[PDB]
Design brief:
Chain A: It comes from Plasmodium vivax (strain Salvador I). Chain A: This is peptidylprolyl isomerase. The PDB classes it as isomerase. Two copies of one chain form a homodimer. Chain A is mainly β. In chain A, 10% of the residues lie in helices and 37% in strands. Chain A has a single domain, classed as Chitinase A, domain 3. Chain A contains two helices and seven strands. The N and C termini of chain A lie far apart (31 Å). Chains A and B meet through loops of A and strand 5 of B. The complex binds 8-deethyl-8-[BUT-3-enyl]-ascomycin (FK5).
């Protein structure tokens, strides 16, 4: 599968697992509410640190607001409805030097499988 | 004048101070597995600085109780609450983010104070 670089520094690289729907009415825009399912794991250990699938409830947020880690705003802006991708985020686009809890160490590369389920204004 | 500081663990690491009593009736207490809806304000005991408020962004927080969907101190605290209860819970770092902390705002080895209000719950 082809790697799609979403920044010039290699820090956000999206692999499309399942292509989403075509057409502009199917790509979300800045400020829209998006609904996704995701599974986040560390690249280095493969261990899952957060999963909406495990909670059995999708996650909603407003796109392009900084409500989520930078790599998520960048990744989801590139997706279309029903797309499922695996995105690799350098720590610069994740939790940085600090990390968050033992399950997200400082300077960790994160891998998220993200499925864009739907969006609305 | 009522101070009620409820020690929810033997190690002193989760102490819930009750600010407003919940509605009476055991029917106003959630069970493990129930989805609960809360508002919260989180701050560091050491500096007193707020690091997050669900109120400020106007987005209530929901999770399924007692399933590890949240830091352990939260599962313990919220299991002890009843509908409309408002508390301030003190969590030692072992019930929060431990030696790692979380992001720029929460250093390693931080005691956390959360004001939590249990708004509603369901099956
Ligand atoms: C794609 C979105 C991510 C997804 C984000 C949301 C659902 C939005 C939700 C309102 C989170 C807040 O978003 C503004 C924000 O809340 C804090 O400010 C906060 O006050 C906090 O302490 N909370 C939130 C309220 C419940 C308790 C606790 C928590 O249990 O949070 C959990 C938490 C961070 C657990 C870590 C996970 C890493 C482990 O290593 C560590 O292990 C110890 C434990 C949260 C709920 C995760 O389950 C889910 C997510 O992270 C964190 C300081 C940072 C966190 O944003 C990251």
């Amino acid at each position: 599968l082809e790697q799609v670089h979403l920044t010039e520094d290699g820090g956000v690289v999206k692999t499309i697992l399942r292509k989403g729907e075509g057409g502009e009415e199917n790509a979300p825009k800045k400020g829209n509410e998006v609904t996704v399912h995701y599974v986040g794991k560390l690249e280095s250990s493969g261990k899952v640190f957060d999963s909406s699938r495990e909670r059995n409830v999708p996650f909603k947020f407003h796109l392009g607001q900084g409500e989520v880690i930078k790599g998520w705003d960048i990744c989801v802006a590139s997706m279309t409805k029903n797309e499922k991708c695996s995105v690799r985020l350098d720590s610069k686009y994740g939790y940085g030097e600090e990390g968050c809890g033992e399950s997200i160490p400082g300077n960790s590369v994160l891998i998220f499988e993200i499925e864009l389920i739907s969006f609305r204004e």
